[PDB]
Amino acid sequence: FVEALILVIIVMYMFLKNFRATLIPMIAVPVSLLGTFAGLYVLGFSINLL
Amino acid sequence: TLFALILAIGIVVDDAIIVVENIDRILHENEQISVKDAAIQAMQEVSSP
Amino acid sequence: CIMLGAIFYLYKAVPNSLVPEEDQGLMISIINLPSASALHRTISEVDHISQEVLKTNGVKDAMAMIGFDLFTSSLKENAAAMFIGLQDWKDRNVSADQIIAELNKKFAFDRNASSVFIGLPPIPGLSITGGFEMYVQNKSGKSYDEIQKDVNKLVAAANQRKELSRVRTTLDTTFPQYKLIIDRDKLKHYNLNMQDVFNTMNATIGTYYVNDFSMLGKNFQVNIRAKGDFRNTQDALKNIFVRSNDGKMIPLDSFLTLQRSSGPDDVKRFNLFPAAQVQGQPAPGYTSGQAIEAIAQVAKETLGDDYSIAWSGSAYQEVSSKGTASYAFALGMIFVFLILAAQYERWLIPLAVVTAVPFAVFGSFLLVYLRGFSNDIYFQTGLLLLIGLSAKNAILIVEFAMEERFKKGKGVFEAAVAAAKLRFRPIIMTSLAFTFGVLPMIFATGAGSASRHSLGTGLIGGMIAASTLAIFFVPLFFYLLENFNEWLDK
Amino acid sequence: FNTMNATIGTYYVNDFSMLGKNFQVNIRAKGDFRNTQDALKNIFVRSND
Amino acid sequence: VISIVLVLCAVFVPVSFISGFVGEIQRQFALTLAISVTISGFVALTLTP
Amino acid sequence: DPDQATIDVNNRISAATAKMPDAVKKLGVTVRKTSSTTLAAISMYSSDGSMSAVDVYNYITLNVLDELKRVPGVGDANAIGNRNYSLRIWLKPDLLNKFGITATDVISAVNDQNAQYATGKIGEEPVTQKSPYVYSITMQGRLQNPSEFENIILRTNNDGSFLRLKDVADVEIGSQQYSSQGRLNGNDAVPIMINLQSGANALHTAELVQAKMQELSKNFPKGLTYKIPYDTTKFVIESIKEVVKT
Amino acid sequence: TGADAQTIASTVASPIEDAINGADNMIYMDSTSSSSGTMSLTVYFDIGTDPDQATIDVNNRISAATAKMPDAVKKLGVTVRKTSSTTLAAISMYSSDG
Amino acid sequence: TGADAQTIASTVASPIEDAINGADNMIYMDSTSSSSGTMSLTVYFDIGT
């Protein structure tokens, strides 16, 4: 998770040039994955290998 | 449930034909208006019922 | 279209598998001294095998359950199972593949006690990851010494040729026993009852549970039994007496003349009827599904008019039903086509988005062919993610091609190029942020590498061909289909 | 009680096995009496003597 | 983007309709990705812009 | 809910097995979930006449009836009459008194000479003298065929001979009970009544019944056939087709 | 306690003839009668079944199938146990040298 | 009946208590044992079961 998050940091600075642009995916990816945990919880799933 | 579906055959087409019929009225009373625009004038009349 | 045929051969020439086994620090050994045998002799061998397994540099800890055979789920005294734990992969310099190929070669071809070393499966559902587990019943009810002579027709021929290479059975009536023969004429000529003579035999050369006694709070059993030295002999029945009705004491050697015999140690009843368990696994190249279709075919041939070729284990979960794997993908495509047809407002345009999917499955089925892998289910898992991403980018491509040709008013050719020009930057930077993201799975060093070595090798080559090979043909199909759509105005 | 239940009626006793399943052994006197008063003449039971 | 969610869930949910021993494993992967596509798709057109 | 109601009755039977007669306790009060009506009724008979009637009942209690109890949805599958063969002991009060034998002598002799008891193993563990092998002990205490039952000796005569059971009784494998018979168009047939669960799908389960009967039909011996003339779900199927027509 | 496995095969034929139950439950079952003195009867239920429901169902029926049991078994005990629960961890206890 | 108040709690309540412990949604339990032969064990469960 944190590796792909850092790869996003690198790709965002290389293709757009401003650090203000790399800060926005630093809030989308945490909240999206974090919300996905709520989805897996209420729907019924549990944290396992698969 | 299968009795209600045969019951629905005569009510499902109620709203369909009640709009298609009002299209025919506008067409036989308006030589100028086109079919695509007549469907617009139809839903103006027979949407509340 | 030539690439489409390349996928048909790529799919037909890759090994159809299920899940891949991986190195999780775990070992199991099925120790089997010769039949009958004794407990102390098994102990003398358990502490001898549990000593040389600790000799290997990749072994950490071990423990055994003496006197319980896992081949039968019973506690036979002539067998034992050993649970071995390996070191951590950061310390051990070898995997369990060559350790098993070393140990099951060192022991299984030497000692009088057979010791086959294997490993626990990764997923507890399957029984032997590729083989079967079937029972053969008999409604007619025949003697076990004859059903033993009937299962031999199956197992000995199932290993001959055909499609299997190790078909086993767990039924063995050639187990040594002492059959006592009664002389009812004597037993009653001697003026005795049978409830008495066998109640006193259960208290001498058997275990007899009388009542309980109090100690430390818990109430434990008390058990009457002759001292072991006057029971280990062949005919220890010669010094056990029973009080007669008249008053005299009578030796059991008069009417109970013991004699040797053969009979099964563990009798198994599967679904109301006596049955025998059949276990095995296919040959190197044969698939699992057809291998289950192999024993079924050969058992219809070498059985009788009363033996039900019943099914259990994992081989029953696969035989249960069929007809579902297709009518789910089909409606999935229909819902995909309609979801797009409602978006693009044309019927012959969503076909452009669909065409960008065979690129993902071509690049995914190519890298798993060069590396020499098999299309398991962890690899097909990432194949779903790649179709969902390849089709996603293709939607936005055709979306901007529709926007360019009908809003900005550019021609079909100039719009099919201007759309691919717009979508080129995001498609590349997602691929570079994703291919590099799941790149640590290609060189995965640790537990669970069976998945990531096939997941990565799948969707890395798929991501390359779905965002470099694919981005050239999505505009072509828009150019072809949109021009054909405007033709239909005529 | 077990004498009347094993001569006039059917008795339970332990079971036996054949052909696979386990069936019962059942005891009842084959002496058939159209009446009943003559039955008690011929059915005996020894006492504690 | 809305069509992406309605089309990615159109490929994740169907593979969850196979009741096989293998299919019950793949239902874990698919429905997890379907929750991700829908939840991250909602975040995409609300929180991101 | 059939189960919520079932395990609510259970929590009242065990709660009230105290205010209970001791004789009913030993055989056990049984609670089960099954419909009060009958879902179907199968009939088996001999298409020629060699299988008779009481023999067909046995083919059911050996191969057929056990599999019918396991298809999904069925609640009960009893064959009426209880005409499966038992080992019958026919005493004769004449010869019982010609030899001074009361019926109780035959009761204890049969109960004792036919039972099966625990024996043990030879040379297990609390031993100091080394034992190379370890052997089990087969028993064989029951009696298989009626001839062995005739030789149950009630009394041992002082002249060496024994008063056997056959000398005062008749032994034959007959029937657990012949209190009922069965007909199907006049022919001697065995009836099997099939019940439904408490809330299953009568259409679904009763169709799986006929499918399983067809499976066991392949192993029928000689002229043993079967017909299911009573099925409360076939009317439902034939009335569903009428609505499709309508 | 004792008994040739053939005799234990005729004391499992009572629960076997009894564990034929399940409204939406049982698929098959396998019993193993052993000369070691024990008999393990494993009943498998159809996938997607409440393990508590399967346990209470098979256990409710054995209470009525105990009247036909030998006294040496009614005295010792018959036990049911759900085995679909995932096995967490194992523990080994021993005394070193001492 | 016929047992000491302490022997009832030691030989009757203990193999019961030790076997019930570990139940799902169980908070606590107590067993009163009297010389009158009665062993009353009440098992309390979590609120809402």
Numbering used by the authors:
A (entry chain B): 346 to 395
B (entry chain A): 396 to 444
C (entry chain B): 544 to 1033
D (entry chain A): 741 to 789
E (entry chain B): 445 to 493
F (entry chain A): 100 to 345
G (entry chain B): 51 to 148
H (entry chain C): 51 to 99
Paper text:
Surprisingly, in the form II structure, the periplasmic cleft of one of the protomers is open, albeit similar to the conformation of the “binding” state of AcrB. We labeled this conformer as the “binding” form of CmeB. However, the periplasmic clefts of the other two protomers are closed in conformation. One of these two CmeB molecules is more related to the structure of the “extrusion” conformers of the form I structure. Thus, this conformer was classified as the “extrusion” form. No channel was found in this conformer. This conformation probably represents one of the intermediates that the CmeB pump must go through during the transport cycle. We thus designated this conformation as the “resting” state of the CmeB efflux pump.
The Cme locus consists of three tandemly linked genes (cmeABC) encoding protein components of the tripartite Cme efflux pump (CmeA, CmeB, and CmeC), where all three components are absolutely required for substrate expulsion. This tripartite system is composed of the CmeB efflux pump, an inner membrane resistance-nodulation-cell division (RND)12 transport protein that contains substrate-binding sites and transduces the electrochemical energy required for pumping drugs out of the cell; the CmeA periplasmic protein, a member of the membrane fusion protein family; and the CmeC outer membrane-associated protein that is integral to the outer membrane. To understand the transport mechanism of the CmeB efflux pump from C. jejuni, we here define the X-ray structures of this membrane protein, which assembles as a trimer. Each subunit of CmeB contains 12 transmembrane helices (TM1-TM12) and a large periplasmic domain created by two extracellular loops between TM1 and TM2, and between TM7 and TM8, respectively.
